[PDB]
């Protein structure tokens with residue numbers, strides 16, 4: 001049963017589209033394919049859906065890029081749909097606008113900057129190799145449960161100095177954040193609230209122990225960056241450490257599944273990566289253009305007209321980032337991975353002050369994964385007649401990716 005809200009007076013009927021971000025029409029064919037259905041040659045740049053409490057959707061890459069870059073007009077005070085969930089959302093610095101945002105991003109950058117991430121390469125590689133060698137000789141694996149849900153999680157827990165046995169409970173919380181249970185805005189609001197509270201509960205004792213700590217882990221490093229000459233306050237720290245976990249454990253996991261499904265169906269592309277190691281390294285950004293995973297929102301600051309559309313203060317706009325990288329107006333043949341594409345511009349990591357803090361880590365993890373995968377399993381395919389199961393939400397998800405190959 002579908003829950004609809006009535007459009008407000010300022011929303012004209014010709015802009016209304018029945019789009020359910022948590023259950024996209026056509027989702028069985030793929031998350032990216034389902035979002036692409038929304039982006040027809042003449043659809044308005046901004047459309048409004050009565051689902052998920054009622055909100056706008058930006059349908060073209062230029063709007064998505066622009067909105068991310070304009071925090072003074074499009075605020076981060078709410079970045080989730082439905083509104084109830086977005087209002088319950090308590091993660092730092094992602095809930096913040098400049099200038100409050102900036103010192104917390106600085107703190108994060110102390111741990112996640114490119115020079116720090118480069119130091120992590122060999123530890124990431126070791127984890128990759130270890131997992132891959134578990135099944136490489138076997139000639140088949142279920143890629144989701146045997147690799148994509150394992151690799152980025154072990155990497156991040158190691159980096160964060162946390163026990164790997166916590167993976168399960170943290171993945172469960174993460175999934176209730178990005179796809180909160182419920183068929184109703186109020187239900188989803190509650191689901192998100194309980195998950196966000198679970199993160200705070202888990203993270204509180206760690207914060208208390210690592211304040212002033214001498215650990216070399218990511219949490220200790222970031223926790224102990226001063227904020228305006230003072231220790232980071234408790235409320236902020238809870239939201240900050242929870243966000244680290246949320247970003248580290250869900251994002252790359254999901255991305256890898258979508259990426260691998262495409263690769264398993266395009267051996268010519270795989271062969272190119274295998275024969276030119278530099279095309280692989282240089283081609284990773286094209287993969288990020290092609291396999292966006294995040295669809296989140298911004299809050300309209302003031303009554304305004306934007307791309308010919310009347311917007312009211314408090315309106316939410318969902319930003320399906322796939323609709324930038326896959327916008328046929330930004331990239332010719334957007335659905336094809338072209339490792340040589342010169343222009344790969346995309347919003348897979350968003351734009352503006354919130355542009356992904358973990359993007360260097362995400363690129364390194366993917367780069368190392370492909371290098372170590374192709375070294376040991378150079379050719380592979382999706383099992384015959386296999387059907388991946390897809391989910392849409394704030395972060396896309398996919399499971400059931402049975403791969404097959406001939407042991408080398």
Ligand code: HEM
Nearest residue numbers: 093094105247248251252255294349350354356357358362
């Ligand atoms: C496939 C991988 C990833 C994708 C597609 C991705 C996507 C994004 C997006 C779209 C945002 C902006 C959200 C918004 O403000 O509306 C973001 C922010 C952020 N991400 Fe990532 N992310 C990925 C990996 C990671 C990883 C591995 C981490 C490690 C902790 C991470 C940490 C963060 C943090 C801390 C922010 C907030 C930055 C700020 O508010 O200034 N992300 N990410």
Ligand SMILES: CC1(C)[C@H]2CC(=O)[C@]1(C)C[C@H]2O
Nearest residue numbers: 091094246247251294296395
């Ligand atoms: C949308 C995000 C991917 C981004 C902000 C969130 O809450 C995430 C789910 C984790 C972080 O990286």
